[PDB]
Subunit: 282 residues, 3 copies
């Protein structure tokens, strides 16, 4: 008989998970390059784009990437996002690169087996399940809406890959309380990377409104916010946003986040139609 | 190929696991519970609902209910709640004939929202009523924290193995067979009544509790009990489970032939 | 349907995992693994250290007094023997089984009774006799504690992957190495390692003072193309070969082309290996 094994996922995925080194020039008195911080990263495609954690590369004078096949590259920082703790790196590779398996049509499910891959002790693999799937939208809601897993997530595998039993990327491990780890869902991680590549930063739309649906009841209105300037008031009920029926608070704030700053959109509330000018997130 | 997944167990079991809010009016304590049946009975931990002025239950489908306290048991750290069942309730899958085995895959289901973790059964534990302590509870390496305490332990079919209860790596759960028995006794009597013979240690008697049933019947230390209540005593642990099932006030012979009357287990 | 279960592995393996009692009162507790019908048992050195009397308890209730055959500091392994004429449960062992990263494993150990936890192989480790440190043991996310230390790490067939030895990363001696160590402890009462005194054709980085290499005339920066009539491709593999060579043996070492006769010696006794230094 065949022993039960996730080795298939490992062989398919693991070569695309790299070591990431943060080196400073002010770290020691002799101003020689020295490692400040270590972490993991995931090679996304053959152009040399790599996703890692922002906290791994913060204030780096030099970023080094090391592949499992022995190759070492200096990396350039494309951009970073504090809200997701993600950063994107670019290495210049000759001769091809290993790349993480991805299936964009795969729907992650609570209970899916996952392996956490991270690269002192060498490349480590730990196993768990998806505890919670989290949200793929741009509106930051906090950590509760990231992907949760009971696969051990430590400083060793942070910025590394979370894959399913087929070796397909589920998310990017991010260190952040009791026996539970977090990852950025891959669908969101991909969106963040494309935005960082294009704009050098993640641009979010911000309407400055709190609320919860029973339409959507407004609990609070941010001061000097787009909603306040438009004339929106507390206790008001928003039945539509940008010609999109609003059945949900979380769903609506995700829609706003996609809307580019400077865009004017109708906000229907009960019936007064207000013209709101979307602004960049804080 | 499809990804390896326990999502089947999740889909079946998870809707039956609820949040429990202890209010003393603000929320003092939080926990999880398991809807047992369509009558609206819910099992949770005693330590969750202790000193509650009001108890509230929230289902994954968003419905919120005020809950009645039916009763609780310190020894198993279980409590039973009851809520309005009118509209119909999601219930935990249960198989009374299912025999749990060491090595069985289990999911612990129960702040950050509903949380599901995976592990195996390390030890099956005893389903009897005589309190033995936590060592005889079901043990699992599926992470057990405050978040899931009072929540469900289920197998890959979604069937209920146990009720989660609080080294560092091992979690404990009341075996579902014992939880079922506790719940029924709480529904009937409003508390768990246990038969108590007051004997430690055929079966060699190590000690005899003072002013206990055994002492009053004439049983002396170092005596050998070959039978209790027309049953052979092969095992101490199994004999005490039998005693626990016996109603207080009942007179049974103890062959060592002495007549003893059962006393209700000490409340503390 | 049927519930997903590793119980098969449990029924095959767990009976062979025993409680080990170090008494001097009981100074220390631990777990052990019955390896074969002869009654040899593997456990941890740190469990049986300074033991006046060692006792072994099987899950079936039988209890035995154990003889200490020997121990090895580098692998934290020790071997016990018990005399049992009533037959013994043995751990399943498959010597042709190749452990892979990602294999499911159960950690079995024998307070709170026998405990079983589940995880995977994070890293396979090395089976060589030359000590490399903890980095090269087998790594697993199956919880490894005082409870199961010295106990068995098995795959889903109940076959032995390794022997548990003490964050969320557990270590075990790979079974292939554990078997080699046990056989050496049984024969010699201690692990005797061949030592050439060289740092890692193969470019020599350093030559230990008063060492076998130094006495043979080998110099630093030299290239070793052969050792004991075997090609030297790799440093790690070559030091494993030397480790198997009995002390006192005289082997040729070809270097570029001078042939040198080296007298292998015992590995200088080092309790300092795992110390940082
Ligand atoms: Ni030292």
């Amino acid at each position: 008989m065949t022993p039960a094994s996730y080795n298939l996922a490992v062989r398919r995925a693991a070569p695309a998970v790299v070591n990431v080194y943060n080196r400073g020039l002010n770290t020691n008195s002799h101003n020689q390059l020295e490692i400040r911080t270590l972490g993991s990263g995931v090679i996304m495609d053959q152009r040399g784009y790599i996703i890692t954690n922002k906290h791994v590369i913060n204030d780096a004078d030099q970023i080094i990437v090391a592949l499992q096949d022995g190759r070492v590259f200096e990396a350039l920082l494309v951009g970073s996002d504090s809200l997701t703790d993600l950063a994107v790196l670019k290495i210049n590779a000759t001769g091809g690169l290993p790349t993480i398996p991805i299936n964009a049509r795969r729907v992650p499910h609570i209970g899916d087996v996952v392996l956490a891959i991270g690269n002192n002790l060498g490349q480590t693999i730990t196993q768990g399940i998806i505890s919670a799937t989290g949200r793929i939208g741009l509106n930051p809601t906090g950590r509760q809406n990231f992907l949760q897993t009971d696969a051990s997530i430590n400083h060793g595998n942070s910025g590394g890959a979370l894959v399913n039993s087929l070796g397909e990327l589920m998310g990017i491990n991010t260190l952040s309380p009791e026996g539970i780890g977090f990852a950025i869902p891959f669908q969101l991680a991909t969106k963040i990377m494309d935005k960082l590549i294009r704009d050098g930063r993640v641009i979010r739309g911000y309407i400055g409104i709190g609320g919860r649906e029973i339409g959507i009841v407004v609990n609070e209105v941010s001061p000097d916010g787009p909603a306040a300037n438009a004339g929106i008031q507390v206790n008001d009920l928003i039945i539509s946003v940008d010609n999109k029926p609003a059945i949900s608070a979380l769903e609506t704030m995700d829609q706003v986040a996609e809307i580019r700053p400077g865009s004017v959109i109708p906000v229907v509330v009960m019936q007064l139609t207000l013209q709101v000018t979307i602004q960049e997130y804080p």
